[PDB]
Design a protein around this nucleic acid. Structure first.
Ligand SMILES: [Mg+2]
Ligand SMILES: [Zn+2]
Ligand SMILES: [Zn+2]
Lengths: 95, 1135, 293, 141, 228, 96
DNA sequence: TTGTGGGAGCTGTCACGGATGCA
DNA sequence: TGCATCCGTGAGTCGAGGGT
RNA sequence: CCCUCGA
């Protein structure tokens, strides 16, 4: 039998730990500081940043989803990143 | 009285009346004698001279050498075992996770007879682990003890078992050596005598008799008197010699073509060939005294001889008639009887040195295989004593032994007494011993031969009862492995001072008196008729002319811990076992305080335990610091003893040595220079002297609960120090090496304020639950970043590798001061396991006060937990304002049969107050017998009540009269031991005199802090998806089967379902339930337990097509969705 | 009749006896047979993997022999060894010697995983470890009422953690649920005022093992107590067979309305005064109380 | 049982168990012991199978024995069963396999294509469904 | 086996060395016995829980007239020693009428303590009570036959799992049973084994012819019917 | 999510055809995981092609490492990009 | 791939029921 | 073929922390 | 699983 002490000891050096129900629950619940910051952005900027560096789509695909050229998706992306960097003073709480 | 065999030892005045003619031997001798034999120390040799000296190693080497090849050409022989110095000191091995070992060399001499050449050489065998001065080993950093193992001695053993059906008295005999193949002889329901060899089928004994060379008439001549042998020979299948060898081989190897000559060779190799069969000198002496062979004391060879086989067969067939006597050719008037498996003349113990030798031998033989293999595959002139010898199997054998044997154990170091008894234990289980499923009830009973050898009191209450005993005080193990005990020789009626050590064997031939026996001052049995014991627990009165030996001392039957219970003989054996066991669970307190009431055993148990620092040689204290002590001998040489300061024991108690000498002081050899964890001025001090009242108090001490004065908190009298060692390593993982860093993700600069630049908590920090002790991060992988983490990393352009926080935090409910940091690196040259890069241990110290829920106990099995700690003003107090310290409920005493605790209390009061018996107009009658220089005592005097020789009842009652008063001339405790107490709560006096006095109370290592535990949610087992187990793992309580029956009997269906699905096993219901509670809405409906799906998968793995059907009769799909949550993830990111 | 019990059964709805002989062995999912790295660079594997590995090795060696056209005696040896290794995998020790690991320990097969008090049935389905549960030493606490128990603060805080978190966010002591979690974990002083609020009238189950009858589990109303011990009303001792020489007890928090209601109604201590075996009361004055009266 | 009939066996056994508990000063109410004894006398051995599909010698629950007798229009004499054997012979292969002798029960259940109605409480415990007792009964649920 | 010599000492006086040593034999024998005894009782409790688990109350009343007769009591009535476990807490099977026509307790009453007292006070020496032996329900038992729930005092509620309560009530004191058997005998009866030292009974009513040999008894019963 | 109202639960003997209808590929190699990279060897007792991916939405060689690519089977790895949960419900088999 | 070449343990358990196998 | 033997079954609960 | 301990 694999020991609970052994399961935990192994979890100490693994890319994902023995996660609890509470951790999963919180991860499935809103991250209020982040959700409010994203909702502060305008629709186009929030959508560009979400598609770009939350879902990780390539820029041509982000274009094809929002049917705008690549340059203006890149514009919306860099400027929404700036606006969110301003909006998130809780980076210092997490950085 | 003086106990002055130890220099500088405190003056503990003794109530004893009998004189001790012998001193307690070195209590660690059981281990030092054994290991110093194994090694062949000079000391051991000298001892041998006083008593053919060979050492355990020398014995292995002479048995193994010479090593000849198959052609008899080249011979290798091992000559001399020697040792180098130790590689590193003990504390250095402890700090660096090493093994305290010394290099072992041997002299390897190779001869080639074909060329006539000789090549000697010094060959290194390995790093042989060493026993300390304290009788222990350091293995991979941790301290360990090798417990002595109770085995059945090599020999020949006959037992009588009634037949299963026929109700006939059957007899069996087992010939059992120290190494080799078993032999057995058994008579069946039918009257055929049979031989069973290595669990094979029972062939007729005639088969073996004819295979040995005995012809049919040669057999009928000897065994003809027993119609059992004639009946089994008439019923024998075949008659002849080589046909008998053929049948032996046929039954010995199944699926094998038999051959006559190879049968001859195999049979001569099994029992008579000294190569692979050996009953040691123990077995040879046992069989020779058992059957009467070789009584001219020849100990030349130790092997199964043919004549021994014939003698055992005849003994069995004559025991089937049960005649009280027998004689063999040259035999000597041998008694015929069955053997007692549990008698300590047939049950020996393999000590540490022999246990080690038995693995050394295995390794050496595995190496001899390679020696014989290399002698053929190598160029005959190019070989050397270094090319043959491969020391890998020997090193592997020693390592395996110390690392996996049941008998190599984690030393329990709660306090010195723990380790002292642990070194003295006799354990019944282990390899070569008896197994736990075969541990009947009779091996666990107190056996009459245990008297003076194995203490009948100290043993565990739970599943190991009667399997773990401890050696008796005066007992010593003989070179054969039998336990002897000393006795005074009584010549014709006078008790001389000649001490003779008898085994349990030699004891049954004599008769033994008691230490309680009157004698005139010159020496003669003034007692007219004695009460004695002989074999099988005899008890009989007898004239002193027939008494051969007498006990050297009371407590001779008793172990160290048992001999420390004052008034033992007033305590029933159950609570006394409880007191012996609980002494070894006392925690060391910040300040140690010897008992006012003790026995003569405290001092001598501290010294021998080893945690006390003792002067090797007389001298003057040249320097004293908390850090070390330097004594300048009269030699001119110096000696310096470094103090262990706040070391962590194996069990988390604080080992803190403290100097008790001053600069300029004169100390003699053997004097204690510094106190250890539970010692006070050289004596073992496991607890505190507490002012006790025996009375119920408002139910707060109901049903064994204990009430404490808050003084014990304020004045730190039951405060202890506890040190945890939190260890964490940075190692190589599937996504790259981990790094010990101060850069922790998702953490603010605030929570890292107590860390240093590298990420380790700073020395001296106060730490609480969850405080980082060592920051660490583990490579994570982009797919494992949360959407919030991915957003944050993108926005702020964090190019740092994605990691998850795997820091070492402070575990729930623990707190303390960081005492020390220790770190090992791979960048530096530091021995680390493979893939392990950085290692760091943070040591945390907590100062635990006594609390509600802690466990306390006296020495008489009187245990309780603390129910309430009252303010000083609430305690019942004496007439002068003194509040009592501890309130013990009256209802607990009488039915447990331990009024020792009460008697102690009385004596505790007397010693606390001091007394002066009148002695004007003559000394009184009660004081006439014992007291002498006990006629008076100064307050807080230190006295001893030796077990079975302590303070008599009348003398105890007498002291209660002449008690000295307090500072106002008031006698606070009357002649019954009772006192008038005021209720501190109201002020009214309690209506009746309450017994008060002083009692030694111990803080047992069962404390609330260690035991409180609660979990809302935590880790889960990967196999079953159920909560992990154990406080250490933040586990959940097991709601077991009987608990579910309880829940069912209530009809509490929903509670039972919720316990069995969402609280453990339902992996989606867990999360949805925590989510519901956090969001303030109703708890949802359970899902399916994951362990049911695991069961189905195991059944399918057994080729069982288990499906689950619906009402329709259609198999149900037991899987979950893929995108079951897509809407709410966007909702949570606000899109 | 014995022999017919088998044939008549194989004579119902297909189920050909051919299933008793196997040409393909199923291999259990690998999560159910874990392999974990140990401190030291060594690994710990479940026995199942060693058994499957011996099956695989011998089957492959048999493939190699069949291809090499080996002697029939050798190929027969390999076929027998394959049979024996599958026999071990399914039920080790049932025939002949058991496959042993180090220390001559027989490897636990797939049959062992199901049987005994350690198999899945008795160890993981008829009883299991649960969340929202604690354990601690018991002390007497004679000041309580029959329906009450002293629950330590540090136990209550953990047991009720999500409840107090929801309330901490309700009363604005925390801005979000994550800060509520951090607050409860740091033991900030705001939590305690909230704790007594949520604890109120929320029953908890106390168990003492061995549970010899249903009264070995009883519900109580928790009073927050100072210290780290559970306080256990003195009249319920008899039911639990609990004394205070070091006994410990387990705490379980019912969550659902139904579980809480079953606790209040079915299991409350003062509703279980009578022994369910004899019909007589058990919560009677026992020792000190007797001497008092 | 075969001489004085089942009603008298039940008396005999309740009294003979109560005697053991009485000689040691233990008060068990009779109704508990009767609840246990009742479960020892719930089957009948088939001597002549008549026109039904019951194999002679088999132990068949009295309810289903008499029910299949009523619909076939059969020589059945009562059996006393020990508790362990009355337990291993239940209509729930899950209940039997989780109780004792798991390998044997499961081999037989496989050979016989047994289908567990999943109606007992233990079975409901194993799969995570509300037990059919107390608050889990449809009347109250 | 009792040692011929007794410990003449009290623990107040303080036992001698041999008295103490001798006392340990039995002390430890009992401590060791406790583990095996609690394991035996636990195994029996598990088997009883399994055999009785599905037994639940299913209906209020099967309305049967079957029951068993319990005794309640040369000059006066002597209370029966076993009223507590066979008469008390039962449902009365038939009206208890005294020497006169008085109806003391009516068919279907609880037979609590007041009712048993009133019964004894009226000279009633036997009562018919419902039982689960005589209970006619197909599956499980009915409430009226079972009687009151011992835990609550009132008549058993319709959902009660009385099999588990019964197994627990029988097992719980099993560790008190010490030494044909004690706890081995309870197991012998519940396992329905052929007992050791079996006493044969009569297969038919008739006359006995008793052949008395040496260590051999031989019994022959000639039936009253005149059959074989 | 299963409503947990299963009527019945039934056993029988599995046919070799059933055993192959359960399996996601044959375990052909005895090796478990690389002594160096700690990664499951192909066709072994922990192979990801047949049993499942060790890490969420990650194939063996890394050509498809995202939730965007879901359900597709890497034509270089043979590994299906899905949750690692599948490694507790996907059986292999062995052809004797 | 060449003179030769069989393990380390073990029993110090007990009661009961029924298939197995043997004369 | 009628048993005797051999085999296979079962042998209390929950805790702590140290190990292969 | 084992070891030592706890009720
Ligand atoms: Mg207790
Ligand atoms: Zn009824
Ligand atoms: Zn790929």
């Amino acid at each position: 039998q694999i020991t609970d002490w052994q399961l935990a000891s192994n979890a100490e050096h693994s890319s994902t730990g023995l996660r609890s129900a509470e951790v999963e629950a919180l991860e499935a619940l809103p991250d209020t500081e982040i959700k409010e910051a994203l909702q502060a952005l305008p629709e186009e900027f929030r959508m560009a940043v979400y598609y770009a560096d939350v879902e990780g789509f390539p820029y041509k695909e982000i274009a094809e989803i929002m049917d705008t050229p690549i340059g203006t998706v890149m514009s919306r992306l860099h400027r929404g990143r700036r606006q969110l960097r301003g909006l998130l003073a809780d980076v210092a709480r997490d950085r | 009285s003086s106990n002055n065999s130890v220099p500088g030892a405190p003056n503990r005045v003794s109530f004893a009346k009998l004189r001790e003619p012998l001193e307690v031997p070195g209590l660690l001798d059981v281990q030092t004698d054994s290991f110093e034999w194994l090694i062949g120390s000079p000391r051991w040799r000298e001892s041998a001279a006083e008593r053919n000296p060979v050492g355990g190693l020398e014995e292995v080497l002479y048995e193994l050498s010479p090593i000849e090849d198959f052609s008899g050409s080249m011979s290798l022989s091992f000559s001399d075992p020697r040792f180098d110095d130790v590689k590193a000191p003990v504390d250095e091995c402890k700090d660096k996770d090493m093994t305290y070992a010394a290099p072992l060399f041997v002299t390897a001499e190779f001869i080639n007879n074909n060329t006539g050449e000789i090549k000697s050489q010094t060959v290194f065998m390995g790093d042989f682990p060493m026993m300390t001065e304290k009788g222990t080993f350091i293995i991979n950093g941790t301290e360990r003890v090798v417990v002595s193992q109770l085995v059945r001695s090599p020999g020949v053993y006959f037992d009588e078992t009634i037949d299963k059906s026929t109700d006939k008295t059957l007899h069996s005999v087992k010939v059992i050596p120290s190494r080799g193949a078993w032999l057995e002889f058994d008579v069946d329901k039918r009257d055929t005598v049979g031989v069973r060899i290595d669990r094979k089928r029972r062939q007729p004994v005639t088969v073996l008799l004819k295979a040995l060379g005995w012809t049919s008439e040669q057999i009928v001549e000897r065994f003809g008197f027993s119609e059992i042998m004639r009946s089994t020979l008439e019923k024998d299948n075949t008659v002849g010699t080589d046909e008998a060898l053929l049948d032996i081989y046929r039954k010995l190897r199944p699926g094998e073509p038999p051959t006559k000559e190879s049968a001859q060779t195999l049979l001569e190799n099994l029992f008579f060939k000294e190569k692979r069969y050996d009953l040691a000198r123990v077995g040879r002496y046992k069989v020779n005294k058992k059957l009467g062979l070789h009584v001219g004391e020849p100990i030349t060879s130790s092997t199964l001889t043919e004549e021994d086989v014939v003698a055992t067969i005849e003994y069995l067939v004559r025991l089937h008639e049960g005649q009280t006597t027998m004689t063999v050719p040259g035999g000597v008037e041998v008694p015929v009887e069955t053997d007692d498996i549990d008698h300590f003349g047939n049950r020996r113990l393999r000590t540490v040195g022999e246990l080690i030798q038995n693995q050394i031998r295995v390794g050496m033989s595995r190496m001899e295989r390679v020696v014989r293999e290399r002698m053929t595959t190598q160029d005959v002139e190019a070989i050397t004593p270094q090319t043959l010898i491969n020391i890998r199997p020997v090193v592997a054998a020693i390592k395996e032994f110390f690392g996996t044997s049941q008998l190599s154990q984690f030393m329990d170091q709660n306090n010195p007494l723990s380790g002292l008894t642990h070194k003295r234990r006799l354990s019944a289980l282990g390899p070569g011993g008896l197994s736990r499923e075969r541990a009947g009830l009779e091996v666990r009973d107190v056996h009459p031969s245990h008297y003076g050898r194995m203490c009948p009191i100290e043993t565990p209450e739970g599943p190991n009862i009667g399997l773990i005993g401890s050696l008796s005080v005066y007992a010593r193990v003989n070179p054969f492995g039998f336990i002897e005990t000393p006795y005074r020789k009584v010549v014709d009626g006078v008790v001389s001072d000649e001490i003779v050590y008898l085994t349990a064997d030699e004891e049954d031939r004599h008769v033994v008196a008691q230490a309680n026996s009157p004698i005139d001052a010159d020496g003669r049995f003034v007692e007219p008729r004695v009460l004695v014991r002989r074999k099988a627990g005899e008890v009989e009165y007898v004239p002193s002319s027939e008494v051969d030996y007498m006990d050297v001392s009371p407590r001779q039957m008793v172990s160290v811990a048992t001999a420390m219970i004052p008034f033992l003989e007033h305590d029933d054996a159950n609570r006394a076992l409880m007191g012996a066991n609980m002494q070894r669970q006392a925690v060391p307190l910040v300040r140690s305080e010897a008992p006012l009431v003790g026995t003569g055993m405290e001092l001598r148990a501290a010294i021998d335990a080893g945690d006390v620092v003792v002067a090797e040689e007389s001298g003057v204290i040249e320097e004293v610091s908390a850090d070390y002590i330097t004594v300048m001998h009269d030699n001119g040489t110096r000696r310096t003893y470094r103090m262990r300061k706040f070391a962590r024991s194996n069990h988390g108690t604080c080992a803190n040595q403290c100097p008790i000498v001053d600069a300029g002081d004169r100390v003699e050899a053997g004097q204690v220079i510094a106190d250890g964890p539970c010692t006070d001025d050289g004596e073992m001090a496991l607890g505190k002297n507490l002012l006790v009242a025996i009375m119920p108090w408002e139910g707060h001490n109901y049903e064994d609960a204990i009430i404490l004065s808050n003084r014990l908190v304020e004045e730190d009298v039951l405060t202890s120090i506890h040190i945890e060692e939190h260890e964490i390593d940075a190692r190589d993982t599937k996504l790259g090496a981990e790094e010990i860093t101060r850069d922790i993700p998702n953490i603010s600069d605030e929570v890292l304020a107590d860390l240093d630049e590298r990420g380790i908590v700073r020395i001296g920090a106060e730490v609480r639950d969850g405080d980082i002790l060592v920051g660490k991060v583990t490579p994570k992988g982009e797919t494992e970043l949360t959407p919030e983490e991915r957003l944050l990393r993108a926005i702020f352009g964090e190019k740092a590798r994605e990691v998850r926080d795997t820091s070492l935090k402070v575990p729930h409910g623990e707190s303390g001061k960081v005492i020390g940091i220790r770190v090992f690196s791979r960048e530096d040259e530091d021995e680390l396991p493979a893939g392990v890069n950085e290692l760091v241990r943070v040591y945390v110290a907590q100062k635990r006060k006594i609390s509600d829920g802690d466990k306390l106990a006296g020495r008489h099995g009187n245990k309780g937990v603390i129910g309430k700690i009252l303010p000083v003003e609430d305690m019942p107090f004496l007439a002068d304002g003194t509040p009592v310290d501890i309130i013990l409920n009256t209802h607990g005493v009488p039915r447990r049969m331990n009024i020792g605790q009460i008697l102690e209390t009385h004596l505790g009061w007397c010693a606390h107050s001091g007394w002066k018996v009148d002695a004007a107009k003559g000394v009184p009658d009660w004081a006439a017998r014992l007291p002498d220089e006990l006629l008076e005592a100064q307050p807080n005097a230190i006295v001893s009540t030796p077990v079975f020789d302590g303070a008599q009842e009348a003398e105890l009652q007498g002291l209660l009269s002449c008690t000295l008063p307090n500072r106002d001339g008031d006698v606070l405790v009357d002649a019954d031991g009772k006192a008038m107490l005021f209720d501190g709560r109201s002020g009214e006096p309690f209506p009746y005199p309450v017994t008060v006095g002083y009692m030694y109370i111990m803080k047992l290592h069962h404390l609330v802090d260690d035991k409180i535990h609660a979990r809302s949610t935590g880790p889960y087992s990967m196999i079953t998806q159920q909560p992990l187990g154990g406080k250490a793992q933040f586990g959940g309580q097991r709601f077991g089967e009987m608990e579910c029956w309880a829940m069912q009997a209530y009809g509490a269906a929903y509670t039972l379902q919720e316990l069995l699905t969402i609280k453990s096993d339902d992996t989606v219901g867990r999360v949805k339930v925590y989510e519901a509670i956090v969001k303030g809405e109703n708890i949802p409906e359970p899902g399916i337990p994951e362990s049911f799906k695991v069961l189905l998968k195991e059944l399918q793995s057994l080729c069982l097509n288990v499906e689950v059907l619906s009402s329709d009769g259609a198999a149900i799909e037991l899987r979950e969705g893929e995108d079951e949550d897509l809407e709410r993830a966007a909702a949570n990111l606000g899109i | 009749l014995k022999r017919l019990k088998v044939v008549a059964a194989f004579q119902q709805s297909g189920n050909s006896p051919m299933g008793m002989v196997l040409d393909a062995v199923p291999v259990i999912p690998p999560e159910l047979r874990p392999m974990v790295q140990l401190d030291g660079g060594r690994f710990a594997t479940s026995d199942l993997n060693d058994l499957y590995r011996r099956v695989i090795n011998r089957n492959n060696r048999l493939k190699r022999l069949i291809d090499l056209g080996a002697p029939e005696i050798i190929v027969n040896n390999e076929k027998r060894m394959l049979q024996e290794s599958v026999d071990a995998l399914f039920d080790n020790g049932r025939r002949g010697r058991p496959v042993t690991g180090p220390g001559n320990r027989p490897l636990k097969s797939l049959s062992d995983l199901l049987k005994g008090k350690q198999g899945r049935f008795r160890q993981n389905l008829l009883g299991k470890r649960v969340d929202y549960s604690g354990r601690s030493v018991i002390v007497v606490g004679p000041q309580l009422k029959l329906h009450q128990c002293g629950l330590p603060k540090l136990m209550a805080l953990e047991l009720f953690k999500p409840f107090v978190m929801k309330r901490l966010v309700d009363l604005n002591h925390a801005q979000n649920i994550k800060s509520a979690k951090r607050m409860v974990e740091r033991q900030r002083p705001q939590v305690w005022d909230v704790l007594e609020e949520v604890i109120a009238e929320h029953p908890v189950l106390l168990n003492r093992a061995p549970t010899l009858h249903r009264l070995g589990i009883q519900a109580f109303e928790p009073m927050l107590v100072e210290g780290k011990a559970i306080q256990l009303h003195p009249l319920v001792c008899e039911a639990f067979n609990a004394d205070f020489d070091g006994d410990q007890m387990a705490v379980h928090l019912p969550l659902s309305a139904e579980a809480q209601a079953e606790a209040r109604i079915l299991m409350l201590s003062s509703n279980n005064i009578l022994s369910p075996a004899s019909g007589r009361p058990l919560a009677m004055p026992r020792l000190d109380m007797v001497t008092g009266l | 049982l075969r001489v004085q009939g089942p009603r008298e066996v039940q008396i005999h056994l309740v009294r003979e168990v109560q005697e053991v508990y009485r000689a040691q000063g233990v008060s068990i109410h009779d109704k508990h012991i009767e609840v246990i004894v009742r479960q020892m006398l719930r089957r009948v051995t088939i001597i002549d199978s008549g026109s039904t599909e019951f194999l002679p010698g088999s132990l068949i629950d009295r309810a289903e024995f008499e029910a299949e007798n009523r619909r076939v229009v059969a020589a059945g004499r009562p059996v006393l069963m020990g508790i362990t054997k009355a337990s291993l012979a239940t209509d729930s292969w899950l209940s039997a396999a989780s109780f004792q002798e798991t390998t044997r029960v499961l081999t037989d259940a496989a050979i016989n294509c047994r289908s567990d109605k999943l109606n007992g409480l233990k079975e409901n415990v194993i799969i995570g469904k509300l037990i059919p007792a107390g608050t889990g009964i449809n009347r109250y649920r | 086996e009792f040692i011929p010599r007794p410990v003449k000492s009290s623990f107040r006086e303080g036992l001698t060395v041999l008295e103490y040593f001798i006392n340990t034999h039995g002390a430890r024998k009992g401590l060791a016995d406790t583990a095996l005894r609690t394991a035996d009782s636990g195994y029996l409790t598990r088997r009883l829980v399994d055999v009785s688990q599905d037994v639940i109350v299913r209906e209020h009343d099967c309305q049967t007239e079957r029951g068993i007769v319990v005794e309640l009591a040369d000059g006066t009535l002597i209370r029966d020693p076993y009223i507590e476990t066979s008469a008390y807490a039962r449902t009365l099977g038939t009206d208890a009428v005294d020497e006169a026509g008085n109806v003391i307790v009516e068919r279907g009453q609880d037979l609590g303590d007041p009712e048993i007292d009133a019964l004894l006070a009226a000279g009633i020496t036997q009562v018919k009570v419902r039982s689960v032996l005589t209970c006619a329900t197909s599956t499980g038992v009915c409430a009226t036959c079972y009687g009151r729930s011992m835990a609550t005092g009132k008549l058993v509620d319709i959902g009660e799992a009385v099999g588990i309560v019964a197994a627990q009530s029988i097992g719980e004191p099993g560790t008190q049973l010490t030494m044909t058997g004690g706890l081995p005998r309870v197991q012998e009866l519940f396992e329905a084994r052929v007992p050791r030292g079996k006493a044969p009974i009569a297969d038919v009513t008739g006359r006995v012819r008793l052949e008395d040999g040496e260590r051999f008894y031989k019994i022959t019963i000639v039936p009253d019917d005149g059959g074989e | 999510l299963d409503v947990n109202f299963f009527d019945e639960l039934r056993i029988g003997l599995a046919t070799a055809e059933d055993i192959r209808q359960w399996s996601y590929g044959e375990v052909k190699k005895p090796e478990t995981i690389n002594y160096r990279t700690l990664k499951p060897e192909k066709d072994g007792l922990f192979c990801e092609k047949i049993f499942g991916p060790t890490r969420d939405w990650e194939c063996y060689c890394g050509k498809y490492k995202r939730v965007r690519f879901k359900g597709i089977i890497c034509e270089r790895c043979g590994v299906e990009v899905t949750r690692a949960k599948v490694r507790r419900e996907r059986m292999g088999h062995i052809e004797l």
